[PDB]
Amino acid sequence: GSDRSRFLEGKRAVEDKNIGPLVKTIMTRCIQCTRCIRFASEIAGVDDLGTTGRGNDMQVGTYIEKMFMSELSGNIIDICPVGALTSKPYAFTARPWETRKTESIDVMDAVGSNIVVSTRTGEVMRILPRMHEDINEEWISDKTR
Amino acid sequence: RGEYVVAKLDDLVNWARRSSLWPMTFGLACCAVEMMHMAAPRYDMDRFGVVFRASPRQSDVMIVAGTLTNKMAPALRKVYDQMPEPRYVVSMGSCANGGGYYHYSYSVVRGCDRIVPVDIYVPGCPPTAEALLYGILQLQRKIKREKRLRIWYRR
Amino acid sequence: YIRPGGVHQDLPLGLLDDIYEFSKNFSFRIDELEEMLTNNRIWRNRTVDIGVVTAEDALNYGFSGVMLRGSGIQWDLRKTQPYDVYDQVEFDVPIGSRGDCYDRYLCRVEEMRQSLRIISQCLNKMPPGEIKVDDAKVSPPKRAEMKTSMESLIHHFKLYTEGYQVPPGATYTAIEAPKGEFGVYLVSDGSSRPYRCKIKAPGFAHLAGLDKMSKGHMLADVVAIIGTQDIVFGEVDR
Amino acid sequence: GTSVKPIFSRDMNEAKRRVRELYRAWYREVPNTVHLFQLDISVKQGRDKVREMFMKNAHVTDPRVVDLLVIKGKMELEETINVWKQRTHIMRFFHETEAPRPTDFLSKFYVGHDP
Amino acid sequence: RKCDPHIGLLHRGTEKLIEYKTYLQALPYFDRLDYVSMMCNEQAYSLAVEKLLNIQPPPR
Amino acid sequence: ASATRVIQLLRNWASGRDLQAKLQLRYQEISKRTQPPPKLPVGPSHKLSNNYYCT
Amino acid sequence: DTRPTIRPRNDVVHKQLSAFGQYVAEILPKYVQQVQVSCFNELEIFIHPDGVIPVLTFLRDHTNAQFKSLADLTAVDVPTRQNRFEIVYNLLSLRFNSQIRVKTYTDELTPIESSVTVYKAANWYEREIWDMFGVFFANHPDLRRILTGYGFEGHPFRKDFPLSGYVELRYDDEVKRVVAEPVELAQEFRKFDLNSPWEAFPAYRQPPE
Amino acid sequence: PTTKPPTARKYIWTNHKFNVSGTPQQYVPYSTTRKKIQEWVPPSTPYK
Amino acid sequence: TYKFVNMREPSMDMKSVTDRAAQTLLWTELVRGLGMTLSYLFREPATINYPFEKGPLSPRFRGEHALRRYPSGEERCIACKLCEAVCPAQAITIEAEPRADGSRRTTRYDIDMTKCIYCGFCQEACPVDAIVEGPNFEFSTETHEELLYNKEKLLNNGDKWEAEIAANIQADYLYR
Amino acid sequence: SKVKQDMPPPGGYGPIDYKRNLPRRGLSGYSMFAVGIGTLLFGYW
Amino acid sequence: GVRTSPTGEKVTHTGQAYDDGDYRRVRFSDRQKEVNENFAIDLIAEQPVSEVGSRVISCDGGGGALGHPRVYINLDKETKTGTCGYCGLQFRQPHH
Amino acid sequence: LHHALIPHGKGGRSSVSGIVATVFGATGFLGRYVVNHLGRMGSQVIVPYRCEPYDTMHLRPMGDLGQIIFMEWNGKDKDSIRKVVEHSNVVINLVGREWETKNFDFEDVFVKIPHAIAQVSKEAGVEKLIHISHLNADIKSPSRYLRSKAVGEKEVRAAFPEATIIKPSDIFGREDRFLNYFASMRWFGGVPLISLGKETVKQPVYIVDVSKGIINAIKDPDAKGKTFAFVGPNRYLLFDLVQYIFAVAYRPFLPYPLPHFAYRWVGRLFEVSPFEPWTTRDKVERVHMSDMTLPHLPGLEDLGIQATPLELKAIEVLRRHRTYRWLTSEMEDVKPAKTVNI
Amino acid sequence: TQDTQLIAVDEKLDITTLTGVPEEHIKTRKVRIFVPARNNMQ
Numbered sequence A: 001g002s003d004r005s006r007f008l009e010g011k012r013a014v015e016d017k018n019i020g021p022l023v024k025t026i027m028t029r030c031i032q033c034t035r036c037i038r039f040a041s042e043i044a045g046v047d048d049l050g051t052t053g054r055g056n057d058m059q060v061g062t063y064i065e066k067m068f069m070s071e072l073s074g075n076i077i078d079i080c081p082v083g084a085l086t087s088k089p090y091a092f093t094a095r096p097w098e099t100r101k102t103e104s105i106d107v108m109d110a111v112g113s114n115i116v117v118s119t120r121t122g123e124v125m126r127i128l129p130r131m132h133e134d135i136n137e138e139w140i141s142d143k144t145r
Numbered sequence B: 001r002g003e004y005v006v007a008k009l010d011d012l013v014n015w016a017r018r019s020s021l022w023p024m025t026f027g028l029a030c031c032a033v034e035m036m037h038m039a040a041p042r043y044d045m046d047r048f049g050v051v052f053r054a055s056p057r058q059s060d061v062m063i064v065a066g067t068l069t070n071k072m073a074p075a076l077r078k079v080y081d082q083m084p085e086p087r088y089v090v091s092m093g094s095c096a097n098g099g100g101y102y103h104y105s106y107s108v109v110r111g112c113d114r115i116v117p118v119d120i121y122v123p124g125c126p127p128t129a130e131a132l133l134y135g136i137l138q139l140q141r142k143i144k145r146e147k148r149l150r151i152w153y154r155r
Numbered sequence C: 001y002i003r004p005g006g007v008h009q010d011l012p013l014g015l016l017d018d019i020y021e022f023s024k025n026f027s028f029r030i031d032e033l034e035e036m037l038t039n040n041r042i043w044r045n046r047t048v049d050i051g052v053v054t055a056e057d058a059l060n061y062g063f064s065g066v067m068l069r070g071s072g073i074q075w076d077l078r079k080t081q082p083y084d085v086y087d088q089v090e091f092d093v094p095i096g097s098r099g100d101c102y103d104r105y106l107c108r109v110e111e112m113r114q115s116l117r118i119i120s121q122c123l124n125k126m127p128p129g130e131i132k133v134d135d136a137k138v139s140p141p142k143r144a145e146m147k148t149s150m151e152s153l154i155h156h157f158k159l160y161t162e163g164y165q166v167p168p169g170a171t172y173t174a175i176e177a178p179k180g181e182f183g184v185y186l187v188s189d190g191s192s193r194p195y196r197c198k199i200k201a202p203g204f205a206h207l208a209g210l211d212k213m214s215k216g217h218m219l220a221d222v223v224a225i226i227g228t229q230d231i232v233f234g235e236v237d238r
Numbered sequence D: 001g002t003s004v005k006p007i008f009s010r011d012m013n014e015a016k017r018r019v020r021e022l023y024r025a026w027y028r029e030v031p032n033t034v035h036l037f038q039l040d041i042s043v044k045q046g047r048d049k050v051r052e053m054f055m056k057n058a059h060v061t062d063p064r065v066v067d068l069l070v071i072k073g074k075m076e077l078e079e080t081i082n083v084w085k086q087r088t089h090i091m092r093f094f095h096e097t098e099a100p101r102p103t104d105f106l107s108k109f110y111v112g113h114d115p
Numbered sequence E: 001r002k003c004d005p006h007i008g009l010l011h012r013g014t015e016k017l018i019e020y021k022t023y024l025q026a027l028p029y030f031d032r033l034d035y036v037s038m039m040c041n042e043q044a045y046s047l048a049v050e051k052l053l054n055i056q057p058p059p060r
Numbered sequence F: 001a002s003a004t005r006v007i008q009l010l011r012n013w014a015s016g017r018d019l020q021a022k023l024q025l026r027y028q029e030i031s032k033r034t035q036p037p038p039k040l041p042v043g044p045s046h047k048l049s050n051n052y053y054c055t
Numbered sequence G: 001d002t003r004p005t006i007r008p009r010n011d012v013v014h015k016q017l018s019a020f021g022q023y024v025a026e027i028l029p030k031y032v033q034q035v036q037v038s039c040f041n042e043l044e045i046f047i048h049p050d051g052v053i054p055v056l057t058f059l060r061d062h063t064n065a066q067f068k069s070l071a072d073l074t075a076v077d078v079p080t081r082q083n084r085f086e087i088v089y090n091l092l093s094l095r096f097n098s099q100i101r102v103k104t105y106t107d108e109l110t111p112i113e114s115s116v117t118v119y120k121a122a123n124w125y126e127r128e129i130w131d132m133f134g135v136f137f138a139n140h141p142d143l144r145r146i147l148t149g150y151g152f153e154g155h156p157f158r159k160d161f162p163l164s165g166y167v168e169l170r171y172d173d174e175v176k177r178v179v180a181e182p183v184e185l186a187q188e189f190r191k192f193d194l195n196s197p198w199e200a201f202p203a204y205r206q207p208p209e
Numbered sequence H: 001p002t003t004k005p006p007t008a009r010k011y012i013w014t015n016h017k018f019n020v021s022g023t024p025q026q027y028v029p030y031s032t033t034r035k036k037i038q039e040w041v042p043p044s045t046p047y048k
Numbered sequence I: 001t002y003k004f005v006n007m008r009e010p011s012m013d014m015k016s017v018t019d020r021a022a023q024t025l026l027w028t029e030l031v032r033g034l035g036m037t038l039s040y041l042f043r044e045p046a047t048i049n050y051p052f053e054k055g056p057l058s059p060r061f062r063g064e065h066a067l068r069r070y071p072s073g074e075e076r077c078i079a080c081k082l083c084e085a086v087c088p089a090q091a092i093t094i095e096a097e098p099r100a101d102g103s104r105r106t107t108r109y110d111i112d113m114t115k116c117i118y119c120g121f122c123q124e125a126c127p128v129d130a131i132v133e134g135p136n137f138e139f140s141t142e143t144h145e146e147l148l149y150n151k152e153k154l155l156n157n158g159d160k161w162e163a164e165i166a167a168n169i170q171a172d173y174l175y176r
Numbered sequence J: 001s002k003v004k005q006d007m008p009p010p011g012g013y014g015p016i017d018y019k020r021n022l023p024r025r026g027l028s029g030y031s032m033f034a035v036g037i038g039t040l041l042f043g044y045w
Numbered sequence K: 001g002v003r004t005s006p007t008g009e010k011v012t013h014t015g016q017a018y019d020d021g022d023y024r025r026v027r028f029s030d031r032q033k034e035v036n037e038n039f040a041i042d043l044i045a046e047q048p049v050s051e052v053g054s055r056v057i058s059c060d061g062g063g064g065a066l067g068h069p070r071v072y073i074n075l076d077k078e079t080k081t082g083t084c085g086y087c088g089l090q091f092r093q094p095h096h
Numbered sequence L: 001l002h003h004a005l006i007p008h009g010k011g012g013r014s015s016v017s018g019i020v021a022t023v024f025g026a027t028g029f030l031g032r033y034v035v036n037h038l039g040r041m042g043s044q045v046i047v048p049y050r051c052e053p054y055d056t057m058h059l060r061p062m063g064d065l066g067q068i069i070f071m072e073w074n075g076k077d078k079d080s081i082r083k084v085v086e087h088s089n090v091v092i093n094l095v096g097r098e099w100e101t102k103n104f105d106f107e108d109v110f111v112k113i114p115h116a117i118a119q120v121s122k123e124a125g126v127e128k129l130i131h132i133s134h135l136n137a138d139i140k141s142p143s144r145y146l147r148s149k150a151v152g153e154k155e156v157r158a159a160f161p162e163a164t165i166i167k168p169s170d171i172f173g174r175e176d177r178f179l180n181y182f183a184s185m186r187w188f189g190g191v192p193l194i195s196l197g198k199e200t201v202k203q204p205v206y207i208v209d210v211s212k213g214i215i216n217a218i219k220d221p222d223a224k225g226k227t228f229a230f231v232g233p234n235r236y237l238l239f240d241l242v243q244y245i246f247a248v249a250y251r252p253f254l255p256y257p258l259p260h261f262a263y264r265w266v267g268r269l270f271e272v273s274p275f276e277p278w279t280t281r282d283k284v285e286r287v288h289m290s291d292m293t294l295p296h297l298p299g300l301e302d303l304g305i306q307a308t309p310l311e312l313k314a315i316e317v318l319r320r321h322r323t324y325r326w327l328t329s330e331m332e333d334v335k336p337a338k339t340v341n342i
Numbered sequence M: 001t002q003d004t005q006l007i008a009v010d011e012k013l014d015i016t017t018l019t020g021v022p023e024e025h026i027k028t029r030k031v032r033i034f035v036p037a038r039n040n041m042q
């Protein structure tokens, strides 16, 4: 990365959406990496995500208001590289550099999905999916998230 | 009335005790050399009248200034024992108050409180000269509001 | 105030004038110190030949600062290995013969005057420029830049969460500290934290020779020895 | 690998012999510290006190690690004779203030969830 | 005849907590190292870190 | 400053030095405590062209 | 050099001190395993933990080196190494205004020959290492606790030692003395996992294992 | 302030207070957060 | 460039030895010591009257901390947690929460005043100038609990010390 | 606006003395001795 | 705007108030409860809803450099009203 | 239990034990030791101190920050009592005055006050009470101490049916007012023990066992309602102790069989001093009254506390009394004092 | 080649006596050894 900006013009802003009381969508912070639309269409098996517009705008969302009903919808938080998609329950409760991550498994499902439990000062903040490939890869159910 | 007399004798005694302290200074860290800066002419901590060294037995208030490590832990407590009554200690600086910048270190007791009881907590790292001189003035007023003779007559 | 990459804050306007005011009057005060102290027989007698270390014993003992200069060793980090900007300045190193504490007392006093000329040249030749490096990855951006340009916000955010990552290495850099040679041996893991940073406390080597410079003299002179040994408990006890 | 450099002692016989000499020295030094330190303990309990911390580390085989151990005991005895340590330092060894801890599994269970 | 000093009466785990604080957080320790001179210690720590960083300060 | 001429020639003679030339404390020689607004400079990389951080 | 932010390099000192590098190598092949010069223009002489006294005495009296005035000796406690402690000497040449570094490796049960004979400055640096790191130095007049408290048990800068240590002290009234109890903190020292998951400077990349 | 008074704002105290330590009006710290791990509510009934 | 500090030799002529003998037999350098401090006696003192007047300070002064708020009265803190990360003695402990309105600011803000070191990293870390150290320094106490601050006390000081904070930051935001 | 920072006056600054200004004061060694006997001889007379 | 708890103390803006049975209330007895009289929750509402006729507005926060980093909030969600995530000031286009 | 009362931690200062003590009269011989032990596992002490905070200052460094909450109160004010124990798991009472005062008569400190706290604390909603009563106290004793403590003991037990009553026999310690009291004869002439003191036996107990009993009584559920008697493991004829402790102090033992009627007047003559009297007529016969050995009352061993013999736990307090002439000495030296061992 | 009483000792290295760990943190402290799994956010 550089150390200073050459941008002297106005910026661009996008209307925020709401696709479920479990993920927060700040679409202005999106980088149009289209990681969301692919994860939904190929892995989640749903098509509630898409990229509308022509030009710089290129809004990514649902056009018509909808909600992410996927049982694996929680992983799209992990997929988004920016703060465009974030966990609603965790929203502004902790910051990453203070969480003492620990490893455990899912129990809601018999799969025993490997999870990373992020705790801080003696309480559990977030359930993050671990990497195990052949059993759970890097994704966990919405219930255990 | 005897209550009025015990009040006047109370006022007469502590007026000296709030104007004639003698500080046994414990020179430990940057808070300690900062004290001697207060005794410098710019602030004159001797005009109220408390001598900069005051010796062990010729002392009233022990200003605990600096980091208090367990190395010095028994030496200060034995010193506090030798300090005659009425004796008060003013914990100076974040290190002596609660530990400050070395609170989590392995070789420092977290706060001078855990070793001796403190009358005045002056904060700073280091506290500015008057910021501790004000604390001395705070201890000065703390001596004004005591009921020593009054409690004895009440008993 | 001094940070990796420069000084964090700027010089407030009118600050250097007061430096000029104090420096002009400072020399007058130091003569008052000498007038009371230099020729005083009681002080001199209590500080001549009381505590003395030879050239090879001092230099072998890891001594530095005043003691090598007091013993006559022609060494000073500012002149031999001029760091920062000390190359472009004029001064002298007050060394002396004999090696006792009176000359060490004289060494410090002439350092005062030889210091005073440095500030005199420094505020006479203060150049205009930015206070910190123009590298945002090591220097936090200006507050106005933070609230206007994003890369300033991101870099300041990362500079104030983990900070810059120092590449691995192991350097012992020492400078002419006012009391001696202060050095830090810092090994870098390659992350945003130092793996291990060992402090070369000048008094730590100085107090190590307390046996040598307090051999034979009367008991009353030991406090004088630490007085000229110049031991501050802050760094010798680490 | 396998070949090692002895600290001071190669064989266990003379390694334990130095332990014996330390063992000899401290039993000669137990009463005098109690006398000079104006202590509040008897000579006896110090002697088996000395004995028992010979025992907390009596089940180690390596000649080097015990040889660092014996000098460490030497590293404590000279502090005691030279009255370098204070009263608070050698009664710390005579653990007195701390509350006794639960020993049985049930007492540990009753107090807290700390294994 | 004997001049062995008993020191450590001030000792703090300075190097130990330096190991756990970042470089920016490590700076104030040196200001607190020598309780007679403050600022010249920052020169030593700063000069080391910039040397490792291969970054030189501006002439100002 | 305050101090009259009679006290002055006593302190000059006893010290042997002209102390009134410069005092150890300041009457009016300092910068006015508030200062006019400043304008900080710029550095070698506040440009928009050929300042790629890679080189 | 149009770039004023980079540290300006110094090539002449680099090659000259590197030229001194193989000098100390050729005359002492028995002792030196590795000679290193860094981008910061400093030499590190990697030596075996057997000839500390000779190689230091060599640098101390050599007419073309006279590398003396021991700065400091310290370890690193590199844990993932079969010899955790790495005793590191620093010497400051007076006649040639240069600096040298000789580093060894040493396990907790392998004494170091006392360098007090070479640099009787080192009479105090090692005493700190004896307690603060734990590595004992052989054939040495006196190695006591000089930094930690009296009767302290452990080795603080060992990487296994916590910041708060194992004991905490207070004044206890029944015993009328200061007593030490197992350490229990009012506030837990909040650790911070902060290393960037992305690749740092590619220059020092570890090769694929 | 006679020459240059401070900018008037609502949250600024209209009556400055001196240091209060040692008086019945002291400061006493306390947890500002909310209760967590809230105790499971038990029902009553008569019984089974 | 080196300067000797003691290499002068005393001349053995009659005048110099007369100076030396006169110097010690009837003390003069000691009397010169008397004269110097006597001139110091007939000089003004530099001792100020506390708290009737105190030594000068600077707008950059770092002292007792105080959270601030916007001209609307809305708090400045956004619980970005920068100050806690940089706080070198870990005197900052903060907990955030999705505030009911939706601005989602901090729930807890406890400054361990007896752990802080007044380094000033907290104010420069904050991107919204929420946490600043007021110029106050006479805030001593008799209780340890008083020193341990909290969000309420911090907000109260910002309501108390507001003229100074606004003015000092107004004289300094161009500098930093 | 032009750049304005803490800069020295264009003539730099006034000269700052730094050498030792120990004063050369007092009468001659014989002079002290001469008066010393002078007061004494007056004393016994 | 702050209510008094049944015990006799007040409630902080976070919603903190000790229950009567809690023993920690003793810290407050013989003393007072420090609570900021002004509450940021109700101190953001009296600001009039700004009516600016533009698609995107940057909210500096007042004072320019002496404010908060500018955020180009968006004014197109007619049902909602745009708000700066730092200031909370409610920006809406009049009737769009 | 209340949510912020579950015991936590390994028993350190910053570990919440759960007990919420409100020790009364902690500024005394026993109050300092108990409040330390209550502060040693993390119990928020709520002591109403009444004297100058300076005399209560030494109680500060035996607890975590924000644990020892000093509170103002008045002995003759019910509202003062109500505030301090309004929210307390337990309340512990040690209000005791060894001498007789003008403002408080002896029954004021042992009949009114001990019962004046039980009913209001029950009114506030307490769960326990550890009001103590001297074991030697007797209804028909010639000492006002033993009469007053007995009559107050039934009232506090009746008003609070769960009020455990501790019966300390003789709590010896650093300033127990017995060992230093026995040492005090050196300045006051010949030891005025009546009839040479061959007719009275005491059973003393080392203080910190008693405090250990109090905390044990707190955490033991069986304590409610019951009455515990706290005695040491060996008993002595008082002629032994005075000869004993004089020999431990290595001072010249100087007994003198002063007649009983003489000391009766002398005791009140000691009380003539307006300040703290050295000896009271209530203590003149309190010393000469022996101890009872009621077996039905549970003791320290039943409570789970072993009793340290006086011989071992004497050199601590004793060292103050001995001068330089034998200051450097250690334990033993003095003969093991012969016990009559019931 | 390194003759300083180079003598074979085959017992497993056990410095447990000198590290400083107390009698309960040596045994009760079960320690895990894994590689930190990549943070799924990054």
Ligand SMILES: NC(=O)C1=CN([C@@H]2O[C@H](COP(=O)(O)OP(=O)(O)OC[C@H]3O[C@@H](n4cnc5c(N)ncnc54)[C@H](OP(=O)(O)O)[C@@H]3O)[C@@H](O)[C@H]2O)C=CC1
Residues within 6 Å of the ligand: L024, L025, L026, L027, L028, L029, L030, L031, L032, L050, L051, L075, L093, L094, L095, L096, L097, L098, L104, L108, L109, L132, L134, L168, L169, L170, L171, L176, L177, L178
């Ligand atoms: N030798 C002994 O002390 C013996 C004591 N006991 C009993 O055991 C307990 C010992 O308690 P301990 O604290 O050691 O005793 P102390 O006499 O040493 O101290 C008594 C404490 O209670 C306070 N107090 C006493 N009477 C009153 C009153 N009327 N009004 C207000 N406060 C009062 C005292 O205040 P202040 O400090 O101002 O005086 C002090 O805090 C008492 O019940 C005692 O009678 C039994 C046998 C022997």
Ligand code: SF4
Residues within 6 Å of the ligand: A029, A030, A031, A032, A033, A034, A035, A036, A037, A060, A079, A080, A081, A082, A084, A085
């Ligand atoms: S995954 Fe996130 S960043 Fe990528 S297109 Fe979707 S919303 Fe934008």
Ligand code: SF4
Residues within 6 Å of the ligand: A029, A081, A082, A083, A084, C154
């Ligand atoms: S943290 Fe990342 S996603 Fe969030 S605002 Fe900053 S750059 Fe955008």
Ligand code: SF4
Residues within 6 Å of the ligand: B029, B030, B031, B065, B066, B067, B092, B093, B094, B095, B096, B100, B101, B124, B125, B126, B127, E032, I117
């Ligand atoms: S509080 Fe700060 S200034 Fe005072 S001793 Fe501690 S570190 Fe030094």
Ligand code: SF4
Residues within 6 Å of the ligand: I083, I086, I087, I088, I089, I090, I091, I092, I111, I115, I116, I117, I118, I119, I120, I121, I122, I123
């Ligand atoms: S000044 Fe105090 S509160 Fe602010 S960052 Fe430094 S230590 Fe933390």
Ligand code: SF4
Residues within 6 Å of the ligand: I076, I077, I078, I079, I080, I081, I082, I083, I084, I094, I125, I126, I127, I128, I129, I130, I131
């Ligand atoms: S005070 Fe500033 S830095 Fe700290 S959490 Fe609030 S906004 Fe962030």
Ligand SMILES: [K+]
Residues within 6 Å of the ligand: A076, A077, A078, A079, A080, A081, A082, A083, A084, A085, A086
């Ligand atoms: K995301």
Ligand SMILES: [Zn+2]
Residues within 6 Å of the ligand: K059, K060, K061, K068, K071, K084, K085, K086, K087, K088, K089
């Ligand atoms: Zn805004």
